[PDB]
Design a protein around this nucleic acid. Structure first.
Ligand code: TTP
Ligand code: TTP
Ligand code: TTP
Ligand code: TTP
Ligand code: TTP
Ligand code: MG
Ligand code: MG
Ligand code: MG
Ligand code: MG
Ligand code: MG
Lengths: 271, 258, 275, 274, 271, 261
DNA sequence: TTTTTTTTTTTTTTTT
């Protein structure tokens, strides 16, 4: 029997309480959800063309340089060279992959190796090269590397309803046991009336494909909106949908994109 | 049954002129008349409506004012977290969010032993054998089971087993499950009224229970701290519908009516 | 184990950012925003019915098989191999060969047929295809591996999701699309996809100049999530002034109205307009 | 099976001098921007409920059967076999046969019925079907077995009776039966209910997405012809022909006008200008 | 069984060797030419405008005056009510609206004077209350050998769009190649703006509620209109909406309702 | 299942062996003349405009005054509440609205002076609030059955319910009076309700043999003035105004009036 | 053989 009375728990609470990881850009988030904590499963939601991976790659950068924590990326959507070059271009403030005038410049100038060890000289970042296999690799990332942040790029091609229920229960048990700060990306569904999500429609908590337990086992959900064919396609609206630790949800802040650099930077906007 | 008018003279005379009670929005036990022995109680709402917080408040008010043994089954979190939340709820402090106070109080043992000087509560980290042990060797009068979605026919057999166990013992039992995904319109998190159809797994959950309580609030709205409570079923009374209103009282954490 | 650390990955990046392009034709704004087609992308071209979603594709296939020397493969499933190989001859020779009976017999008589056939198909560049979703991908691999095609065009994806009998069609489109994207990322071939648009709810039709949204892709929601460029064509039947909409650019961020084209009922080329 | 385009020197040649259109009747504005009807060319005809589809297609079947020598097979599902046969006889002899018991009793006693019958069905040009995968099997029995040049189907809404997947599979099968076989295939479908305003039978101009059953009917059809008239208005015999889709040429819009004959049943090209 | 045109040399000659005339108004018979074997006739109006009474009158006229066997399937009311209505409306009275007159006809033995004169030559068949309907109608048309089959209030028989569509397809297939006039009664949906169908709204063809299969499979469509709130609640208007044999639609004529004998007579009111 | 006309030799005479009247306003029996077996009477007004005030009054005048075995199936409340509603309505007092009178009537022995005069001869029946309404007719024998508040009792369900209740009325010899409501707009100011102001679907008016609408202008000059309008009558055809009735606030009753309108 | 969850396409039924 593993039943424990309330009296014989005095030390286990006293040792227990002896904020967490903050966000970068849209500074109303950590003002609202008080940042991520060890043992949380986070969902990032938008449509295609909104820049979910662009948002999460900045968080991968800022939690590996300023915080020094062991950050493990899981780019199931793309290759490791593309995300490595995007990290180099984001840290070095100048857009790398989306320009050809500089790709041949910085390789013959000799400062490629200068930019490489400036950000990968530590043992911080760990990439993944493309269910049971993925979870065994995450267990190796947790044991054999000591990762503190794990980012998972795309969950829909992980499924070739119950296969998402089993996956989300297994991921929640993994984050409960190991206590790793986890970010998991999923997409939105197709609405049947009115505008789509990509033209400035506010996203409700229903809009989760595949199954319905994506909102039942995750600890917080961040959504991003932006009128794509609009008067400005740069201003994003960030919306907290759920928070089990604080509870306060809604519209948090507003960011612009800064097309030369690529940094999601906060913008003042009354309404 | 078909009601005739032959043997119904002395019953109607009773119509002109309970057990454990519920705390907060007091038209619960004014309407369904509290908790009774041998019942199976369901509190089902949307994801994030405060099911666990409401049953945590009721587990507080059924263990101190009544003194009865309270056996929890919090298979969603750990035993220290729900204990810190109960200590902060008794001490009127949002504990697990106030980071400076957590190291300021460590009077910590003073607030611990004040509410745990008895052997009242019994937490938990097969499961029916554990519940039978909590019922026989410990004298529990309230048993709460928070998560049952991972614990059709695989849920129906478990519900038959729980209903037979409750009828055989005679203990107050509260079991929590979630709601299904609505198809058209808004969701339950934006003010949609919950019907008895919306229960995941199967349909025996409404046929083998005794009362169902639902909560609805506008989570993406102006007031995310104003629920509406709805009784959906009560085999003893029958009075269903709107019960009351609770605001969360952010500073403290007590669901208080207004 | 494939958990490659970020420090021991320099050389690969050394052979990555030195060794892109392959510009479109007919319009300039398509090459400004999307910056051409790349090895390993999926470019999707959408329209209504009879709106010219194959004419722009063949006008792009002629420029990418002759003016740049790339080997091009055509999985055309609407049209047989006898018509789409006959439209290209008159297009390069700037006429409408299929829509005219006189010019057909004129190039029969004087012997100009062999001259026009050898000027176009004198180089081993265009590899066609004629017409169950399992053998099509094997034929695409047979085109890419041995023959070595750079731009492969999958015309009319709706036939392999409709003639294939499935109870649930959404998972069929999702699984076909993710296996196709996996093939395109594995072999690194430029891939063009043609799909249709569904029935709208009310109002105008897409064949009457309705401004198309990204959510109107017919069949599933897996079409817009695993494509890298979405380009839409919109006219009003001036039944020849078509506008082009970049609905989703993964690589860059410039989306919106790209440009304007004009179709020629004398030659068959999509010239750019000026408005 | 993949092929290389340098082995195609003998087949593109053979296709180049093989392909000959069948000219429409009733309006010459149809033949100018469609150039007729070819092998492997699914032609859709639609109108409102009872607005003149079967009369038009039966006249087209008469003109393609007795004036151009083309063997024609029909699959009429609305009516009986003897009814459409007597309708063809009465329309070829320029009378109104079935709508008059007096002429039907008149021609059966003086023996001119056999004279009207042998001049049509002497050469054995028409073939009929006696009332869905067995349907295409019998159509291939008609085509590959006998050898008619134009196959007409009517009233496809019986054949599909989740309707959308069924009619999508049916439209793909009919397109595959038309293409790469060598037959013209004529298909008739209906319209759905409108949202607001006036009805399709009261003179509303029909759009392309009004084809009831799916939107998979307008993506696999080559030529789409829509007939529309006002049966309650001042001119209830002035049909308007609207070409909605044309894969071969691309010109869409109003072809012209046709005027139906209240006595002989021959809708003929009128000269009304709006 | 692909049959060529040569094999109909003897069949067409047998097919050349008949419209059943409508009663109540001769304006219907001029632009319909009656009804042949395999001729689906849809009869509609608003709610309570006399769809059952007009079809009951035609069931009377086609049975006792022309010798054609009529098989009714009245589902609005039961068997005894429509039998009393047929007897009272052949004897030109209002039978059910007079308690003393129902009681008198058994005291003087004249009940068999009105039963024998009508129901003796087997010229009628009834039906008491979807594939259990057609299986009995086929027995009504095969073994019994009736000539006009009548179906009342089709909404009892019926997502109710595929159901009414397959029903109308089965009824059309049962009518064709059998040789029977299949009278079918349907209804009309709600109006949207202005006045209602019970106040005399000019009905359109697309108001046949349930599907579009009620206006695309019927050979003849007859609609009735009556302003029961205006000046004359005894003057109905008859509108032919579809005729696949002749091709004339519009106002067929006016019929005057008589509030004494239960009959409606041909009226001569002009607009 | 096929019924010829030869086997109706005596069975039409079997139908010759009668309607059931109405009360309160005499304009109802003038143009409807009652209700036999197989008749459905839809009675409606706005949601809370006094449907049950007239329905239970007719059920009272049919049960204790004309001997007909009235059975209600009130599904808003249980057995005891509507039984005490029948008692307090028959004894002309506002029962469930004042604690003083309910306090005063329980002790002075005027309770069991009221049970044997109404509920003693087992006519009134109720439901334990398909397989039950057949036993309510066969074993019990009650005929005039009322079902209320169909919004708890949105197109397929109401059509299937109305079709099964239509089939329950037919071939039984039973009078099933069903109550429904109106769609939202103002209906509380005397707005003329046509037959199109139903809600749910249009399948209600297709099977309802008789349709009765109730109007009242509770916001004008005299709020206690109501009106009854027949909308659909399949037995006669005469539909329209029954007359005027006046309501009373202190006793809870209504009287037929003849105001000049 | 009997249930539950979930995604995308077309046709008719109703409302502030
Ligand atoms: C946030 C943002 C991104 N962008 C551009 C920059 C990048 O080129 C691109 C980033 O979007 P992606 O991150 O590539 O798209 P996604 O991950 O959200 O969607 P999916 O996985 O389904 O394909 O969008 C803008 O133009 N404006 C913006 O505000
Ligand atoms: C009711 C309410 C709760 N909250 C907080 C309290 C909790 O921390 C959180 C929601 O209550 P929880 O009880 O934690 O939600 P849950 O247990 O039902 O979630 P799950 O379905 O995954 O089991 O939000 C508010 O902030 N405002 C409110 O009005
Ligand atoms: C775009 C365009 C096409 N056309 C003509 C030329 C094209 O050959 C003809 C249609 O040919 P397609 O380009 O093949 O038509 P489509 O691809 O849009 O339709 P489907 O999906 O059925 O294949 O339209 C014009 O006349 N003007 C125009 O602007
Ligand atoms: C077009 C037209 C038809 N008519 C009449 C006479 C024709 O025989 C009749 C058309 O009969 P059909 O052509 O057989 O009917 P349809 O194809 O339009 O529709 P459906 O089969 O679905 O019912 O309409 C005219 O009188 N004038 C006209 O201009
Ligand atoms: C025909 C007609 C009937 N009436 C009266 C007497 C009829 O019995 C009554 C109509 O009853 P029904 O004929 O039964 O009404 P209905 O069949 O058109 O519609 P539903 O079955 O949906 O109710 O109205 C008139 O007042 N004027 C008339 O012109
Ligand atoms: Mg992405
Ligand atoms: Mg919980
Ligand atoms: Mg095309
Ligand atoms: Mg026809
Ligand atoms: Mg009727």
């Amino acid at each position: 029997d593993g039943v424990v009375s309330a009296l014989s728990l005095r030390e286990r609470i006293r040792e227990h309480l002896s904020v967490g990881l903050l966000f970068s850009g849209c500074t109303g988030i950590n003002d609202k959800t008080l940042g991520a904590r060890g043992g949380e499963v986070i969902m990032v939601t938008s449509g295609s063309g909104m820049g979910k991976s662009t948002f999460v790659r900045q968080q991968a950068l800022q939690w590996g340089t300023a915080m020094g924590k062991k950050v493990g990326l899981a780019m199931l959507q793309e290759s490791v060279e593309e995300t490595a070059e995007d990290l180099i271009g984001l840290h070095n403030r100048v857009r790398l992959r989306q320009s050809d005038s500089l790709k041949r410049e910085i390789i013959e100038n000799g400062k490629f190796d200068q930019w490489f060890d400036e950000l990968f000289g530590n043992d911080t970042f760990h990439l993944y090269d493309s269910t049971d296999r993925l979870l065994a690799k995450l267990a190796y990332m947790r044991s054999g590397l000591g990762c503190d942040v794990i980012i998972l790029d795309h969950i829909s091609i992980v499924v070739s309803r119950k296969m998402i229920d089993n996956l989300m229960t297994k991921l929640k048990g993994f984050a409960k046991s190991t206590g790793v700060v986890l970010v998991v990306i999923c997409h939105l569904k197709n609405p049947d009336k009115g505008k789509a999500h990509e033209e400035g429609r506010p996203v409700s908590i229903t809009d989760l494909r595949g199954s319905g337990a994506l909102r039942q086992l995750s600890d917080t959900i961040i959504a991003l909106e932006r009128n794509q064919q609009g008067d400005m396609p740069n201003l994003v609206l960030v919306r907290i949908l759920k928070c089990r630790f604080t509870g306060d949800t809604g519209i948090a802040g507003y960011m612009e994109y800064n097309k030369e650099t690529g940094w999601l930077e906060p913008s003042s906007y009354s309404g």
